[PDB]
């Protein structure tokens, strides 16, 4: 009944919209419902025209707001998106008595707004906008009246909203400083403002939350006042005083006019700006510095002539917050967009239409991320808006529609030049903007003022020491990419000092603890030593519960809690308290996943909150699948995976997310063309901006994790926003990892317990240490570190030993020890030296036999166990008798010992459910050997894919279309319920690298292996894989055109090297072939040997003589034979 009820509430029970929607009204009456609902976009655009702020609501949001005009519940819920500064509407007696800001401030209206069912949302919302403007002005008027009369500052702050008190204080400060400027008497007024600062600072310690926030912001403003007043007091001449005073912002009121809302204006450098009296709430105020003031000056100069403002410079200097603070100072709130390459001409044009009609100020962040084409195209619209404002036009034409021009708008752009993934503005677009450099903020003043606000005993000394220490670290640490000690790091430190004030006592101890927590987790060993020594040089000087939670979580999950592992867990736990965005960088297999899962589980134990975690592979997904896409053909927005998750969390239909944490893990390489889209999500804006116009807030408990192994192509724009955790080395020893793997393999399985004891005794680290040490010296083709090869050893050994459980009950102790020893030796051999050549494998067998002890069961080249007794493959090779025609068959394999060994080990590995990669020269028999191994099986079907340069995830998924079914998360199963599927990947390493050095298809295969599932993009659902295995083959990564594959993939698969057969082997095989053929002419069968010899000799001499150094296509292999 859902769809009819939805469209009935939307379209059915409404006889006013039929004058614009007569077709849909009649069509609904007859009733397809979905298509009618998608046909209402024209009316939605009509409704947007009647209230410009509606451009920040999606189509569904407009449908809801239009429908529920009889309740006025839903309209409140959109205030955060429509106005930004307002959280909700305060209703009473079917009328509005006030509004509630984001910070919790309540604004009362001068007159209650009576509501009716017949009055549409746009109508009384326009009334509300006028009423909010009038109420803010009224409180400003009354507060200025009281302050000018002589009322004390401390007895007015508790009566009025922040804006009224701020602007009254500013106007009085301007007037009084100008009167002081009339003469040389500045000492008395400096003392007066100092006393006011002291009074407010003392009152701060005795305050409620809202009063606390108001007093903090007022203290910021009065510290700026005092600094300015002191500077003017210390000028030499009158001209110096006038020169200094002309450069700061002055707050004047037109007390001689009739227009109330336009009575206040701002003077700076001879130019005047109009104060708007828009409600902004109680935002965090920026400490005033010379750079901030000069930025305000440049923005004022640009706005005088209606030119677009522009700030450029390196990342982390406070450009966007400078723009926002400028807007706040002018009594208005700036709408912030996050530009991306998903924007095009239509998106920017629509956003400009919205900003035009609203009368809002818009700031475009990361403007360089727009591609060149749209940067060229939108210059016409930029020029038209500028010309319209300068001339005084009443309408402008955008996207073929004439729309009104609200004479309050402004366009600002923030751009970071010279960064990866950024572009360059064309000249005819730059000429429409006034650029200003923001290269270096005055961090010392910021630190000093913030510390003074926090109430620290000595702000000057601590500010000096912190800033000097950060400079020393930036000067002394090694040359590494992820070292940034600029303003964002300073803010992280100072913010972390806040919760620790009562822990240490408003002194140096808090500062040093904050420095440690912020900086140490991101440093290496050398830089850790430098940090600790320097911190000791410059500065003079109980976690038991969370530690025990971590211990419990680790032991229950089964990971050894080593000292390094616990250290990293503790650092992560303290970092995630205040950082909503963390990056974990370490080598493949070092234990990042263990670290963050363990810490979240410990937090779940400690707090009792639920934890829902989503794992997204950024590179495998395209951007239009991750962040969603607008279909321009229908103008219909459809969410991506990340956008869908955020929307669902914000909706919170059942309230399930009120007592839980949401974790989003990006398990792939950082890519500046993906992660930068979330810049405004990660930084203080905490907002996701979509191209369609929506603005999705980020909940306070919504944290994002990035997991990768490099920071090569990542720019400072992301590194300086996210807290960074650096893993120098593996979190545990080889013994601990073997213990974990053995416990997990056993638990996955009386008899098994004694067998567990036997196996654990067999895995004696005393000899395995030396075996690994001398394994490290071999040549590994497409190799992997020893630390990431242990998994194959343990898994295969456990599988092999458990396969013989049926015959252990009747064995003596010596027999059991011998079988276990031989199986473990063979598994260790193939795990460590499987990717080496034959001679290397035999020497490694020799070393294994040496180190396990002379008195242990010996492993040999072709040793095996038969149904128990020990034997060898060399005695178990049957002969083959072919008929002549059977030489034409593709599925004939002449048996031989090396073939049997390869087939046996491959099949054993496959049974253990370990992914397999075959590697060897072309023609060595990889696909043949695979095919022969599974041809005679009854457990597996085979599906083959041929990979190439331009294959994608789509080809691999389409290859399984006729073999698999989707069965309701969702599951993907083989169609047959008796055999599994083995999906063999031929030439896995050919698919080329993208512009940043990644293989999306190989990452997709990694996701299939590791997570046993993937994300279905059109529906944004999780698909679990049950009975599909992944194997593949490639040539070595030295032949032309082959792409080396990252360790993060290959660590999940055993690697077997397959070289060419020896000369005698080829001679015997092809002698057998010629013997089969000569049955046609048996009178020449005496020549079977010399013909085979001639063929093999000719092959060898052609291969040696005609190399690829002559022609690229001179490749010779047994295929020719």
């Amino acid at each position: 009944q859902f769809y009819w009820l939805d469209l009935y509430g939307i379209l059915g029970e409404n006889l006013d919209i039929q004058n614009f929607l007569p077709l849909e009204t009649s069509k609904f009456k007859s009733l397809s419902l979905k298509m009618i609902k998608s046909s209402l976009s024209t009316f939605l655009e009509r409704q947007r025209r009647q209230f410009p702020r509606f451009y920040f609501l999606g189509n569904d949001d407009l449908l809801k707001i239009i429908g529920s005009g009889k309740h006025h519940d839903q309209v409140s819920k959109f205030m955060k998106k429509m106005f930004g500064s307002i959280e909700s509407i305060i209703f009473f007696e079917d009328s509005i008595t006030g509004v509630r800001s984001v910070e919790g401030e309540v604004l009362n209206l001068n007159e209650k707004i009576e509501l009716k069912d017949s009055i549409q949302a746009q109508e009384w919302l326009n009334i509300l906008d006028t009423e909010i403007k009038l109420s803010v002005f009224t409180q400003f008027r009354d507060c200025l009246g009281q302050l000018k009369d002589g009322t004390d500052i401390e007895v007015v702050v508790s009566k009025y909203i922040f804006q009224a008190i701020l602007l009254s204080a500013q106007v009085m400060w301007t007037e009084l400083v100008e009167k002081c400027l009339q003469t040389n008497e500045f000492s008395k007024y400096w003392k007066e403002v100092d006393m006011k600062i002291k009074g407010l600072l003392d009152k701060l310690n005795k305050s409620s939350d809202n009063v606390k926030k108001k007093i903090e912001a007022l203290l910021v403003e009065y510290l700026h006042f005092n600094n300015v007043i002191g500077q003017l007091k210390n000028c030499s001449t009158k001209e110096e005083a006038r020169l200094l005073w002309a450069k700061v912002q002055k707050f004047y009121q037109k007390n001689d006019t009739l227009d109330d809302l336009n009575s206040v204006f701002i003077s700076q450098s001879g130019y005047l700006l109009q104060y708007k009296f828009e409600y902004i709430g109680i935002p965090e105020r920026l400490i005033y510095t010379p750079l901030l003031l000069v930025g305000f000056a440049t923005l004022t100069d640009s706005l005088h002539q209606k030119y677009g403002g522009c700030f450029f410079g390196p990342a982390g200097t406070g450009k966007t917050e400078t723009v926002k603070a400028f807007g706040q100072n002018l009594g208005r709130v700036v709408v912030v967009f996050n530009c991306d390459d998903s924007f095009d001409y239509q998106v920017l044009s629509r956003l400009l239409v919205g900003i035009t009609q609203i009368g809002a100020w818009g700031c475009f962040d990361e403007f360089n991320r727009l591609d060149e084409k749209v940067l060229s195209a939108v210059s016409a619209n930029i020029q038209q808006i500028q010309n319209g404002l300068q001339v005084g036009k009443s309408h402008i034409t955008l996207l073929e529609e004439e729309t009104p021009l609200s004479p309050h708008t402004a366009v600002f752009i923030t751009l970071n030049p010279g960064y990866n993934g950024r572009s360059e503005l064309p000249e005819n677009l730059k000429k429409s903007f006034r650029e200003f450099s923001m290269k270096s903020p005055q961090s010392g003043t910021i630190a000093e003022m913030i510390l003074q606000i926090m109430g620290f005993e000595d702000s000057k000394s601590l500010a000096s020491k912190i800033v000097h220490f950060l400079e020393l670290l930036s000067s002394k640490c090694s040359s590494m990419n992820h070292y940034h000690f600029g303003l964002r790091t300073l803010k992280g430190v100072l913010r972390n000092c806040s919760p620790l004030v009562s822990e240490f006592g408003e002194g140096e101890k808090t500062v040093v603890e904050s420095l440690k927590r912020v900086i140490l987790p991101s440093l290496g060993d050398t830089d850790e030593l430098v940090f600790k020594d320097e911190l000791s040089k410059i500065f003079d000087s109980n976690s038991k519960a969370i530690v025990q939670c971590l211990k419990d979580a680790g032991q229950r999950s089964g990971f050894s809690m080593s000292e390094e592992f616990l250290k990293k867990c503790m650092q992560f736990y303290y970092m995630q308290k205040t950082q909503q965005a963390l990056i974990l960088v370490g080598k493949a297999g070092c234990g990042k996943t263990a670290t963050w899962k363990t810490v979240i589980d410990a937090m779940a134990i400690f707090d009792g909150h639920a934890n829902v975690v989503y794992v997204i592979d950024t590179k495998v997904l395209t951007k239009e699948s991750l962040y969603g896409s607008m279909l321009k053909a229908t103008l219909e927005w459809r969410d991506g995976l990340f956008t869908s998750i955020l929307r669902r969390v914000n909706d919170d239909i059942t309230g399930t997310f009120k007592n839980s944490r949401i974790w989003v893990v990006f398990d792939s390489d950082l890519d500046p063309e993906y992660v930068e889209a979330m810049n405004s999500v990660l930084d203080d804006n905490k907002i996701l901006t979509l191209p369609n116009g929506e603005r999705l807030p980020i909940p306070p408990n919504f944290r994002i994790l990035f997991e990768t192994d490099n920071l090569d192509h990542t720019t400072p724009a992301t590194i300086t926003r996210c807290g960074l955790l650096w893993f120098s080395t593996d979190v545990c020893s080889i013994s601990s990892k073997i213990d974990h793997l053995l416990n997990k393999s056993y638990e996955a399985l009386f008899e098994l317990d004694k067998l567990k004891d036997l196996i654990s005794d067999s895995f004696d680290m005393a000899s395995l240490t030396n075996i690994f040490t001398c394994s490290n010296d071999l040549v590994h083709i497409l190799g992997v570190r020893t630390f990431n090869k242990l998994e194959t050893a343990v898994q295969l050994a456990v599988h092999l030993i458990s396969s013989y459980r049926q015959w252990f009950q009747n064995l003596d102790d010596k027999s059991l020890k011998d079988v276990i020893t031989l199986l473990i030796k063979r598994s260790l051999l193939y795990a460590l030296a499987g990717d080496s050549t034959g001679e290397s494998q035999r020497a490694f067998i020799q070393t294994i036999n040496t180190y396990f002890g002379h008195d242990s069961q010996e492993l040999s080249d072709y040793s095996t166990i038969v149904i128990l007794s020990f034997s060898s493959f060399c005695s178990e090779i049957p002969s083959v008798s072919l008929e002549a025609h059977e030489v034409m068959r593709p599925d004939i394999v002449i048996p031989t010992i090396d073939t049997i060994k390869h087939e046996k080990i491959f099949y054993d590995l496959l049974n253990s459910k370990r992914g397999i990669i075959l590697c060897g020269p072309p023609g060595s028999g990889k696909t043949m050997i695979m095919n022969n191994a599974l041809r005679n099986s009854s457990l597996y079907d085979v599906v083959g894919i041929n990979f190439s340069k331009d294959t994608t995830t789509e080809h691999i998924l389409s290859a399984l279309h006729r073999h698999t079914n989707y069965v309701t998360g969702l599951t993907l199963l083989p169609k047959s319920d008796i055999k599994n599927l083995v999906l063999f990947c031929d030439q896995i390493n050919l698919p080329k690298l993208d512009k940043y050095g990644s293989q999306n298809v190989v990452l997709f295969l990694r996701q299939l292996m590791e997570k046993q599932g993937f994300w279905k993009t059109p529906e944004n659902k999780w698909v679990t894989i049950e009975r599909i295995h992944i194997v593949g083959a490639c040539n070595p990564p030295t032949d032309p055109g082959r792409i080396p594959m990252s360790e993060r993939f290959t660590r999940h698969a055993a690697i077997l090297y397959l070289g060419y057969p020896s000369g005698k082997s080829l001679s015997q095989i092809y002698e057998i072939y010629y013997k089969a053929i000569f049955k046609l002419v048996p009178e020449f069968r005496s020549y079977t040997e010399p013909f085979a010899r001639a063929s093999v000799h000719l092959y060898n001499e052609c291969k040696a003589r005609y190399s690829t150094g002559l022609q690229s296509h001179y490749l010779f292999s047994p295929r020719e034979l």
């Binding site: 020169l243 450098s269 001879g270 440049t298 095009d344 749209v374 060229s376 000429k431």
Partner: protein
């Protein structure tokens, strides 16, 4: 030494207005390097010609379709149409514009049509068949200091004209300084007509509210150094150079030695605006830019500009010798 040849033999030289005004063509291609754009030259031209110039940037299908329609209209009814950054849409330059221009090679039947195209000399290749039909003009800065100030002055109550004259000198001097990339400013920068225009606006705004002749010269210096021109400057050394030049020019002295040649006295408030403009123009036109103006007028070490100037002369002379041998 290089200018010797040009001055001795050649007795005339054309500008953009000369080329457009005296041409049988009606399609014009302008080219420049990065961060140099002559769109304002075309708008000044069109205003001087009392022509309606419509400017369309290319790079998107919407602007392209609108451009096709407006090209048709501008060729049937008349009017000037400008297509910016044609290299951005070569697949349309090489297909649509290529065919149409040949068609207008044929019609030559409407007198009030002119099409202008801009492109970058450092960008991609435009098709030769289209390139060799339209007229071609290269836009670049005026090399001489006195020439630059003369042009700026020619493009344009006594205090207003006096401050404009000083600003013209300042703009010429700073633009000349930008040539010495390793000696003048630490980093390469560009200055254009918008900086001059904003400086003029600020100077007029200051003059509007200082009727006492107590000109706040310190405010003028700080604003011009820091905001109008300093906004582009991201280095302390270069900003100090700018501050030095501002202190030299806008000092407010009774008679400024703006260069080792002309001295500029302050105006008399008893004189008319036309009188003071005539006096300033006479002061400008009566002087001579010396051979070593790169040093004396910019106060640079001679040995520093020597490498710059000599290497330019070396390249020019070497190319001339190679061409003459062949």
């Amino acid at each position: 030494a290089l200018n010797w040849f040009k001055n001795e033999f050649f007795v005339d030289e054309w500008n953009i207005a000369d080329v457009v005004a005296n041409s049988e063509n009606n399609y014009f291609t302008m080219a420049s390097e990065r961060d140099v754009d002559g769109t304002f030259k075309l708008i000044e031209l069109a205003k001087a010609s009392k022509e309606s110039l419509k400017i369309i940037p290319l790079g998107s299908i919407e602007n392209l379709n609108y451009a096709q329609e407006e090209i048709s209209k501008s060729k049937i009814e008349g009017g000037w149409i400008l297509l910016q950054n044609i290299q951005m849409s070569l697949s349309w330059v090489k297909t649509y514009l290529h065919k149409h221009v040949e068609e207008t090679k044929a019609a030559e039947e409407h007198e009030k049509f002119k099409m202008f195209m801009t492109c970058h000399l450092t960008g991609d290749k435009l098709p030769a068949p289209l390139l060799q039909r339209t007229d071609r003009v290269v836009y670049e800065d005026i090399p001489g200091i006195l020439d630059t100030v003369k042009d700026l002055w020619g493009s344009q109550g006594v205090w207003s004209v006096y401050c404009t004259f000083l600003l013209s000198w300042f703009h010429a001097l700073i633009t000349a300084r930008t040539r010495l990339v390793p000696h003048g400013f630490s980093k390469k920068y560009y200055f254009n007509d918008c900086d001059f225009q904003f400086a003029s606006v600020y100077l007029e705004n200051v003059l509007a509210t200082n009727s006492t002749n107590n000109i706040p010269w310190a405010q003028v210096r700080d604003h011009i150094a820091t905001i109008v021109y300093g906004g582009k400057i991201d280095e302390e050394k270069d900003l100090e150079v700018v501050a030095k030049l501002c202190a030299h020019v806008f000092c407010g002295s009774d008679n400024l030695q703006i260069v080792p040649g002309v001295r500029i006295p302050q105006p008399l408030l008893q004189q008319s605006e036309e009188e003071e403009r005539a006096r300033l123009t006479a002061i400008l036109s009566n002087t001579i830019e010396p051979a070593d103006s790169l040093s004396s007028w910019l106060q640079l070490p001679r040995e520093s500009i020597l490498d710059y100037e000599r290497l330019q002369a070396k390249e020019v002379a070497s190319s001339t010798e190679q061409l003459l041998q062949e």
